[PDB]
Design a protein around this nucleic acid. Structure first.
Ligand code: B7P
Ligand code: CA
Ligand code: CA
Ligand code: CL
Ligand code: CL
Ligand code: CL
Ligand code: CL
Ligand code: NA
Ligand code: NA
Length: 326
DNA sequence: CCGACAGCGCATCAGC
DNA sequence: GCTGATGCGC
DNA sequence: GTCGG
């Protein structure tokens, strides 16, 4: 947190651009700048020193100068005073409400938490769940609880079919002391890039986790991605644990390494790596790394036996999960 | 200057 | 119903 | 908002 003030500032600017201006590239520009500053190993003394880093240009440099000179940013001070921007920003904190729905609600006079509750009839299913657990989803999850949740998920999945493999990814796999939510990568040998030999492979796992009252709500569910809500069991007389977001991703077993690289993140790390892959003439998604030909069209999947192979292909030295927290 | 900015699953909608 | 675009989230 | 060519 050497430059926490600056990275907080840029993050609030990124959120503004995404939520209020709907300017997704400004949002990504501010987030990249915040990311590169967060790993800079010195206390930044001036915007000119900051402009040296890639992704910090003239505009951000000047903002950093204002922030360093005064401790604040007038442009953010104004955004914070504007009722409509602040309302739009707030409503996007509910899961399922993005910038478009947020502005639509605010334009209808739905501006507060109370307003959402009073108008729950106007929400789709995802939004209603996001509102139900709004307070809970704000909380982080300590790693000790993540370890208990891991124990439950892996054991319940073994009970369904011992050939499943569940891997907890995201910030947990990167070694974080607390996580925003739980990400579970699932494989099974009957589901490969070649064939699906069994149906309902994800459904059964979700069904088992519902049966033991671990999963409590479904935000969305298809054949390969589940997004819902879970909760640790509590003891006699104990306050209940907060409800937690859980994401489950069933990946073809032969594409495990691209899948776990994707799901381990961070999102910014993935964006840097995939951008770099493009520069080196490849494209990476959660399934494959493919070469781009002269026309820039994806060719056939390259062979991959490890996370490190993906790094090797784009001529990056290997970075362990804990060093991917960008 | 100016294109290019990572990649994609699921829910919902308009249009057929 | 399907297809393609859009919103949303990871 | 930033920047490589
Ligand atoms: O845009 C994205 N792209 C993108 O590849 N992923 C990938 C990378 C990310 O680690 C993983 C899970 O997403 P989270 O939103 O759960 O991110 P965490 O890094 O786990 O942090 P937290 O501790 O839960 O807050 O999906 C997320 C995106 F959101
Ligand atoms: Ca997570
Ligand atoms: Ca997640
Ligand atoms: Cl933009
Ligand atoms: Cl400020
Ligand atoms: Cl793979
Ligand atoms: Cl692919
Ligand atoms: Na720079
Ligand atoms: Na939201």
């Amino acid at each position: 947190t050497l430059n926490g003030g600056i990275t907080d500032m840029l993050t609030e600017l990124a959120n503004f651009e995404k939520n209020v201006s709907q300017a997704i590239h400004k949002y990504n520009a501010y987030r990249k700048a915040a990311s590169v500053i967060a790993k800079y190993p010195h206390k930044i003394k001036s915007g000119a020193e900051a402009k040296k880093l890639p992704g910090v240009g003239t505009k951000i440099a000047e903002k950093i100068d204002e922030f360093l000179a005064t401790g604040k940013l007038r442009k953010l001070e104004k955004i914070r005073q504007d009722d409509t921007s602040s309302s739009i920003n707030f409503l996007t904190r509910v899961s399922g409400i993005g910038p478009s729905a947020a502005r639509k609600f605010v334009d209808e006079g739905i501006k507060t938490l109370e307003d959402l509750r009073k108008n729950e009839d106007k929400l789709n299913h995802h939004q209603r769940i996001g509102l139900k657990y709004f307070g809970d989803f704000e909380k982080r999850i300590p790693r000790e609880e993540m370890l208990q949740m891991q124990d439950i998920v892996l054991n319940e999945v073994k009970k369904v079919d011992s050939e499943y493999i569940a891997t907890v990814c995201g910030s947990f796999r990167r070694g974080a002391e607390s996580s925003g939510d739980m990400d579970v990568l699932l494989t099974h040998p009957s589901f490969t890039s070649e064939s699906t030999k069994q149906p309902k492979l994800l459904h059964q796992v979700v069904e088992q986790l519902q049966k033991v009252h671990f999963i409590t709500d479904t935000l969305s569910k298809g054949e390969t991605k589940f997004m819902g809500v879970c909760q640790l069991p509590s003891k006699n007389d104990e306050k209940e644990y907060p409800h937690r977001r859980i994401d489950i991703r069933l990946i073809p077993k032969d594409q495990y390494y691209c899948g776990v690289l994707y799901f381990t993140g961070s999102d910014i790390f993935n964006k840097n790596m995939r951008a770099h892959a493009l520069e080196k003439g490849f494209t990476i998604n959660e399934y494959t790394i493919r070469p781009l030909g002269v026309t820039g069209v994806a060719g056939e999947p390259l062979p991959v036996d490890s996370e490190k192979d993906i790094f090797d292909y784009i001529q990056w030295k290997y970075r362990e999960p804990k060093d991917r927290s960008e």
